[PDB]
Amino acid sequence: SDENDVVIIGGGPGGYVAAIKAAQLGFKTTCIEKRGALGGTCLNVGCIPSKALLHSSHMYHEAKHSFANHGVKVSNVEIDLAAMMGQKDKAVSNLTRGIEGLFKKNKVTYVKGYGKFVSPSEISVDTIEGENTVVKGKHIIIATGSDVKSLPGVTIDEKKIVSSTGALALSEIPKKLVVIGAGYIGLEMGSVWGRIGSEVTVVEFASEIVPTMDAEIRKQFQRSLEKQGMKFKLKTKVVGVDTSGDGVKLTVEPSAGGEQTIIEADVVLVSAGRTPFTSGLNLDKIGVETDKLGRILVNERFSTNVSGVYAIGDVIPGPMLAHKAEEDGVACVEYLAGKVGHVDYDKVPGVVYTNPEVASVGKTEEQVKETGVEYRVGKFPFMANSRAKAIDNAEGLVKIIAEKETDKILGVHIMAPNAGELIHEAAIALQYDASSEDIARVCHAHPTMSEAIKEAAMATYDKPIHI
Amino acid sequence: SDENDVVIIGGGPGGYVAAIKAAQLGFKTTCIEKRGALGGTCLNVGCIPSKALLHSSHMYHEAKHSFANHGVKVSNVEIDLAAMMGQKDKAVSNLTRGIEGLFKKNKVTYVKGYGKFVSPSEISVDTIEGENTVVKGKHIIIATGSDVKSLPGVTIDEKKIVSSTGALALSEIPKKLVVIGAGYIGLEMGSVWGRIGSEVTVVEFASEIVPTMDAEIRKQFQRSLEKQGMKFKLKTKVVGVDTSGDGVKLTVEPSAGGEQTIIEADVVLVSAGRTPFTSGLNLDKIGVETDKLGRILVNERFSTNVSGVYAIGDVIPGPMLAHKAEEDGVACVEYLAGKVGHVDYDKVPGVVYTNPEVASVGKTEEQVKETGVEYRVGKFPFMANSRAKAIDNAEGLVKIIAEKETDKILGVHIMAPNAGELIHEAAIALQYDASSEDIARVCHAHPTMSEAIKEAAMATYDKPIHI
Numbered sequence: 001s002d003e004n005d006v007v008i009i010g011g012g013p014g015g016y017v018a019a020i021k022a023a024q025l026g027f028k029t030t031c032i033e034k035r036g037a038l039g040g041t042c043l044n045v046g047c048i049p050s051k052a053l054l055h056s057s058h059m060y061h062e063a064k065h066s067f068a069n070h071g072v073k074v075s076n077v078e079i080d081l082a083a084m085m086g087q088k089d090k091a092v093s094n095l096t097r098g099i100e101g102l103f104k105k106n107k108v109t110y111v112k113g114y115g116k117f118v119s120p121s122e123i124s125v126d127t128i129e130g131e132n133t134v135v136k137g138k139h140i141i142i143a144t145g146s147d148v149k150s151l152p153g154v155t156i157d158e159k160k161i162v163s164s165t166g167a168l169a170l171s172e173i174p175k176k177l178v179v180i181g182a183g184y185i186g187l188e189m190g191s192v193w194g195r196i197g198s199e200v201t202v203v204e205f206a207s208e209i210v211p212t213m214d215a216e217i218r219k220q221f222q223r224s225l226e227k228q229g230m231k232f233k234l235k236t237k238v239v240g241v242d243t244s245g246d247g248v249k250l251t252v253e254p255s256a257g258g259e260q261t262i263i264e265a266d267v268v269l270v271s272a273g274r275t276p277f278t279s280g281l282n283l284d285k286i287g288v289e290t291d292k293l294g295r296i297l298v299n300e301r302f303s304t305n306v307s308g309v310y311a312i313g314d315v316i317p318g319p320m321l322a323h324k325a326e327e328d329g330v331a332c333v334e335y336l337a338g339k340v341g342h343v344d345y346d347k348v349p350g351v352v353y354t355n356p357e358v359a360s361v362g363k364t365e366e367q368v369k370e371t372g373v374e375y376r377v378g379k380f381p382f383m384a385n386s387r388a389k390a391i392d393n394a395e396g397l398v399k400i401i402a403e404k405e406t407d408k409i410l411g412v413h414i415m416a417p418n419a420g421e422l423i424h425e426a427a428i429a430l431q432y433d434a435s436s437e438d439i440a441r442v443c444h445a446h447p448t449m450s451e452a453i454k455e456a457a458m459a460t461y462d463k464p465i466h467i
Numbered sequence: 468s469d470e471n472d473v474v475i476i477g478g479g480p481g482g483y484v485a486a487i488k489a490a491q492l493g494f495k496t497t498c499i500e501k502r503g504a505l506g507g508t509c510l511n512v513g514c515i516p517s518k519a520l521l522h523s524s525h526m527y528h529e530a531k532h533s534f535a536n537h538g539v540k541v542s543n544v545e546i547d548l549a550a551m552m553g554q555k556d557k558a559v560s561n562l563t564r565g566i567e568g569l570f571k572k573n574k575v576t577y578v579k580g581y582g583k584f585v586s587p588s589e590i591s592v593d594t595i596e597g598e599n600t601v602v603k604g605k606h607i608i609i610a611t612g613s614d615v616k617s618l619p620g621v622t623i624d625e626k627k628i629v630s631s632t633g634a635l636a637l638s639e640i641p642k643k644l645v646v647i648g649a650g651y652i653g654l655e656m657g658s659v660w661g662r663i664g665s666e667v668t669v670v671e672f673a674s675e676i677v678p679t680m681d682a683e684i685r686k687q688f689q690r691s692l693e694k695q696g697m698k699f700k701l702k703t704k705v706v707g708v709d710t711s712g713d714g715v716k717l718t719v720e721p722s723a724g725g726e727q728t729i730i731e732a733d734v735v736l737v738s739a740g741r742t743p744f745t746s747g748l749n750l751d752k753i754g755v756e757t758d759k760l761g762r763i764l765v766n767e768r769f770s771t772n773v774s775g776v777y778a779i780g781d782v783i784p785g786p787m788l789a790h791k792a793e794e795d796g797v798a799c800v801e802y803l804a805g806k807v808g809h810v811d812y813d814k815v816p817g818v819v820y821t822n823p824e825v826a827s828v829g830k831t832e833e834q835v836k837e838t839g840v841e842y843r844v845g846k847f848p849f850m851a852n853s854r855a856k857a858i859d860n861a862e863g864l865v866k867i868i869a870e871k872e873t874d875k876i877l878g879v880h881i882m883a884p885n886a887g888e889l890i891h892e893a894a895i896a897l898q899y900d901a902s903s904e905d906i907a908r909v910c911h912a913h914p915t916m917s918e919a920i921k922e923a924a925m926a927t928y929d930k931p932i933h934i
């Protein structure tokens with residue numbers, strides 16, 4: 001009998017990987033997803049879409065500003081917004097098909113519909129046309145995702161007050177835009193539209209922008225987000241939003257000294273946070289215990305209170321990133337299969353894809369401080385990097401943190417274009433409790449942006465050769 | 468006088484680093500260089516200049532072809548060739564100053580002039596309509612460099628037929644151009660000008676372009692260069708040339724299938740190889756080893772067939788690259804300082820900065836075949852990299868080579884844009900005899916071109932999750 005071995009309610013990173021990894025381990029698997037296509041949130045409404053726009057907006061910008069200095073003289077430069085959204089969409093889908101086609105290769109049974117627990121072992125799937133399909137397995141992996149964080153006095157239409165999705169799909173470059181949340185998704189939209197033409201301003205309630213980011217780096221990062229138009233109204237809450245006019249009227253009064261002011265804006269991007277998503281999951285019948293917010297509680301082996309049920313991804317505690325998600329999925333399946341699964345949220349990198357990207361792995365100088373341990377810091381600016389200079393794209397710096405005694409690397413933060421590619425050399429060295437010297441002992445190709453990392457390393461235990 | 472400790476005849480990577488590492492170690496050091504500025508060759512007419520052009524010529528290309536798809540319209544595009552050469556020059560000097568300023572920092576005594584051995588302890592500097600400065604020291608590091616190469620159709624003369632240098636400073640985009648050598652440098656210039664507007668054709672005597680390149684990768688790499696406009700000619704060579712007025716009249720004769728055909732041109736780039744450059748200095752005096760195709764023979768500690776004397780860089784055996792050089796100079800000095808200096812030409816990375824760059828580290832499949840050791844190959848195309856597709860810049864692949872038994876990595880080859888950065892992840896793992904699994908166990912930031920390396924790894928020892 002071909003008895004079904006695993007069901008995953010969720011078709012995103014946690015799911016389609018868990019699904020796939022599962023098939024590859026030899027399990028009859030069924031991923032189930034209600035959304036239209038199989039990408040997760042990453043594929044249809046975030047990373048990808050977001051990354052795509054980010055690069056089109058950048059091309060536009062580089063073409064209006066840099067081309068000159070290089071001998072590439074253009075006459076006029078515009079933005080066929082209609083097109084842009086095009087390759088974005090072109091890409092998203094394309095990507096999706098490939099996933100669907102991955103499921104076929106690995107024999108994942110794709111069930112379009114909305115799951116709802118009917119028992120610790122059987123799921124009733126909501127709608128394909130208004131019906132009910134019954135999917136049953138020994139082990140079930142909840143992989144529902146996350147969704148938009150609501151904001152108290154700002155209901156979201158889809159109109160001049162948008163979310164992640166709305167922002168990535170406007171149909172008119174707003175003149176004046178205001179982003180409420182001030183984190184990664186926020187700074188990211190802010191950049192997109194802004195490069196395109198908008199006049200953006202961010203309004204955060206918090207003391208600084210992007211709290212998890214390493215201070216020293218943050219400072220310079222903001223400054224850069226500024227140097228090139230952008231503005232932040234820090235430490236400010238918003239009583240009521242006003243939408244009875246041209247654009248949107250904001251009545252922002254700080255997070256204490258209750259003396260309101262009013263911001264004028266066409267569209268307002270609400271980038272407050274994101275919450276787990278369990279809603280409509282049939283979650284009561286067997287009641288998996290959740291925490292104060294909503295994430296689903298889980299153990300080493302990713303199991304819920306309910307023997308037979310697991311949870312991974314943006315639904316359980318941990319950083320809310322696609323690869324963190326991917327990471328749990330696999331770890332989870334390896335365990336199920338009897339192998340040993342390995343996670344470790346302390347080394348799951350973080351990258352903001354703004355103009356200068358800011359990739360970080362390991363701890364921040366702030367955290368190191370908290371551990372009272374004696375450390376040293378190494379730093380090297382791309383202003384000294386041969387490649388960078390040779391290109392005239394030298395904003396940025398590598399910064400590594402090591403134990404003074406051991407030289408063991410604690411964290412490595414980078415601010416620079418294509419930083420997300422460069423942080424890997426650090427990420428791998430950090431995985432194997434390596435030291436500055438070690439990474440500096442590696443011969444790097446010259447000229448390359450990578451050289452910076454090498455130089456930052458030297459600057460850590462010894463002394464740099466180009467600064 | 469504060470100069471007697473260490474003497475270095477050469478201002479290139481080998482010399483200026485040697486020179487700086489030295490001062491850093493506690494030696495009164497002196498670098499002597501005949502050229503105008505302190506860059507090496509990897510600064511005044513090589514690496515850098517070359518990279519600069521490459522990028523500029525790329526920007527021009529991309530704006531005439533890619534921009535559309537991203538909703539970026541330009542009304543007329545053209546090349547201010549005068550500007551380009553400029554940024555290039557601006558950048559070049561800019562870097563040089565910094566080097567000079569580095570010597571001031573570490574206290575290297577810069578002595579402009581043309582060295583010449585007067586004794587294993589003394590050399591005779593001087594000039595073109597100039598004095599004759601006096602430096603003699605205990606340990607002397609020869610660091611003269613390398614230079615262009617002959618052929619039976621050479622004309623080392625500014626503008627009619629060029630060298631590396633000429634090509635980097637033409638003053639007129641040639642209608643038809645031909646590059647004779649067909650390797651690193653050659654493909655690069657052919658790419659630079661081909662983008663800009665020239666119609667190029669590369670003529671190599673060798674069976675294939677770029678011999679040291681891994682077959683499989685070479686196969687596709689060529690095919691790529693092929694669609695960008697170049698027409699390669701292999702199995703043939705030029706016996707008759709023709710500086711008769713307007714352009715050359717190349718007479719193409721093959722291996723010995725001898726015959727007569729003609730290549731009409733508007734300029735010819737001769738990218739035959741590069742020879743060590745041991746002239747100036749005086750060897751004919753203190754009988755040093757000059758026994759190979761012109762190289763200065765050496766030992767473990769980098770000492771010649773002579774005391775007090777040393778050699779490093781493009782003048783000694785090994786690969787002719789800046790970081791190889793950089794590597795020798797430092798290993799050399801560390802030794803003199805009584806520390807252990809360590810070099811490894813088997814781990815010195817290779818990168819061709821053409822459109823798809825092609826970076827390789829470790830051995831090629833053909834080399835690994837010769838060892839007769841059982842191995843496995845991992846590959847993964849960018850066509851399936853999310854970052855990559857999201858951008859619409861997915862040409863290329865990542866390919867890992869491991870021992871079937873151990874899984875130790877033997878080599879990593881990458882064909883892709885920005886592949887010169889990507890390779891370090893491999894590069895560093897290969898430095899520490901790590902395994903596919905090892906680099907796959909590393910958590911990679913999604914969505915990044917780096918993921919391809921993680922996938923190509925798993926595809927090696929196990930099975931990938933996206934292909």
Ligand SMILES: Cc1cc2nc3c(=O)[nH]c(=O)nc-3n(C[C@H](O)[C@H](O)[C@H](O)COP(=O)(O)OP(=O)(O)OC[C@H]3O[C@@H](n4cnc5c(N)ncnc54)[C@H](O)[C@@H]3O)c2cc1C
Nearest residue numbers: 012013014034040041042046115144145313314321322325
């Ligand atoms: C604008 C934006 C930008 C982002 N950028 C990045 C970035 O650059 N890098 C990064 O690492 N992360 C980024 N993220 C976050 C990343 O997308 C998430 O961390 C990741 O998708 C979480 O994976 P997941 O497996 O939980 O799946 P999710 O995609 O969150 O969710 C899986 C799917 O579950 C489905 N589902 C839920 N309940 C049910 C049910 N009952 N029945 C059927 N189907 C159901 C949903 O349709 C959903 O698509 C971004 C997010 C947003 C919103």
Ligand SMILES: Cc1cc2nc3c(=O)[nH]c(=O)nc-3n(C[C@H](O)[C@H](O)[C@H](O)COP(=O)(O)OP(=O)(O)OC[C@H]3O[C@@H](n4cnc5c(N)ncnc54)[C@H](O)[C@@H]3O)c2cc1C
Nearest residue numbers: 479480481501507508509513582612747780781788789792
């Ligand atoms: C077009 C081109 C592109 C290249 N691109 C790359 C690349 O992308 N990446 C890479 O790694 N490598 C590249 N290379 C090769 C790289 O530049 C060399 O490997 C590197 O510079 C060698 O270092 P070196 O220490 O030997 O110095 P070199 O620069 O070769 O030589 C040092 C200096 O010695 C001076 N000198 C010679 N004799 C005397 C004397 N008697 N007295 C005083 N001074 C003297 C010369 O003027 C010379 O500039 C390229 C080369 C060329 C030609």
